[PDB]
Design a protein around this ligand. Structure first.
Ligand SMILES: Nc1ncnc2c1ncn2[C@@H]1O[C@H](COP(=O)(O)OP(=O)(O)O)[C@@H](O)[C@H]1O
Ligand SMILES: Nc1ncnc2c1ncn2[C@@H]1O[C@H](COP(=O)(O)OP(=O)(O)O)[C@@H](O)[C@H]1O
Ligand SMILES: Cc1cn([C@H]2C[C@H](O)[C@@H](COP(=O)(O)OP(=O)(O)O)O2)c(=O)[nH]c1=O
Ligand SMILES: Cc1cn([C@H]2C[C@H](O)[C@@H](COP(=O)(O)OP(=O)(O)O)O2)c(=O)[nH]c1=O
Ligand SMILES: [Mg+2]
Lengths: 189, 184
């Protein structure tokens, strides 16, 4: 069970992934919750540079890929041990933020993601959609309005490219409403 | 002008490149010296991580590329201001060390390098060869069998493109080598 949460800043990812972790734990599931960038000792060192320092779009992309490669190395084992792995952001983020947001190109980033993850693809990905103004009012260097609009639109394209994996949630709903939707979709495995 | 030096840890890179600067400073030429990994503020942070931490081959590779794309942007400026760029280690480093040394594939690393460096190829690159024990005599990237692989990687790369890579015998004298480079 490999599930990821995606969406722009302020969409509600961190909140929802935790509510989901509790629900699966209470039901007697071995849950592993991780975030990106970060999730490993060195990945967290990488995360601090990405947030604290300004970098070119390609270097920025390579840093997210390094952190991702390190995180994958660890979670794969968990997955191969009956553990449920929940991730706060994954490959779609690089596609949406660096592919669309920074305009490096959807295809290029996806190919790099493939090399970086050795093909580990989520079974289920919750994309929480919300308009930018709402997200920013409720919610770093990534939160610029225009940038985030391109990101949001990029995520919507991705939802269209992988409808089997990506489940689009309506971020305008209440926190508890969305959680209902989340649990409802999980119930199907 | 864009110059770069390659070769394993202890082949005589820092020594040569300098001696090729104090020569150009001597003849007016405005040169700037940069090294990889590092060369920029964030790059030195990435450098620290690569030397102090244990990372998987790919993370290792992506960290070098991140550092390279940052420096490259800064190098495009100097070769825009008419400067002279002497660089200790570059794309070949990733190919030999990550491609062959880590066995991630020559073409793979080569393509990432293109993407990360926006197709910036050095005019002249000096590959300084030496056996492993000698170099060691003179970090985590220094395990004989690995270096062996890296050396092989450098030589197989020297074959491919003999257009810019000029080999030298680091087992020689510092002045002997120097002279050989001063020519080009
Ligand atoms: N559906 C929601 N309705 C109202 N506020 C929300 C909703 N989801 C999240 N928030 C609030 O927005 C802020 C950031 O949420 P977070 O879960 O941290 O979003 P992300 O992790 O997507 O930035 C918090 O105050 C969170 O409680
Ligand atoms: N041609 C040479 N012959 C003998 N020793 C050399 C030669 N070139 C460099 N050295 C010495 O090898 C050691 C490492 O050289 P360095 O220039 O630091 O190599 P790298 O920069 O490849 O580590 C130093 O003692 C340097 O003076
Ligand atoms: C995983 C990933 C994150 N990011 C950015 C998006 C976030 O603004 C930043 C920090 O992630 P997070 O801490 O998840 O930010 P937020 O809680 O506001 O959503 O990382 C990318 O640009 N590319 C990526 O691949
Ligand atoms: C630029 C680069 C360096 N390296 C390694 C070479 C060294 O082991 C380490 C530090 O490089 P460097 O400081 O040049 O050390 P040396 O003088 O011994 O050559 O980084 C790679 O593995 N890949 C790369 O792309
Ligand atoms: Mg969050």
């Amino acid at each position: 069970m490999f599930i990821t949460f995606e969406g722009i800043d302020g969409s509600g990812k961190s909140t929802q992934i935790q509510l989901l972790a509790q629900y699966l734990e209470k039901r007697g599931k071995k849950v592993i919750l991780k975030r990106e960038p970060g999730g490993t000792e060195t990945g967290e060192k990488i995360r601090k540079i990405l947030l604290e320092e300004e970098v070119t779009p390609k270097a920025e992309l390579f840093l997210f890929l390094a952190s991702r490669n390190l995180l994958v190395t660890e979670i794969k084992q968990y997955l191969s041990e009956g553990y449920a792995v929940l991730l706060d952001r994954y490959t779609d983020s690089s596609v949406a933020y660096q592919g669309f947001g920074r305009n490096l190109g959807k295809e290029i980033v996806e190919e790099l993601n493939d090399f970086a993850t050795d093909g580990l693809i989520p079974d289920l990905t919750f994309y929480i959609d919300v308009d930018v103004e709402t997200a920013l009012k409720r919610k770093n260097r990534f939160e610029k309005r225009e940038f985030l609009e391109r990101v949001r639109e990029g995520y919507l394209v991705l939802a269209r490219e992988h409808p089997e994996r990506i489940v689009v949630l309506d971020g305008k709903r209440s926190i508890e409403e969305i959680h209902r939707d989340v649990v409802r979709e999980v119930k199907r495995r």
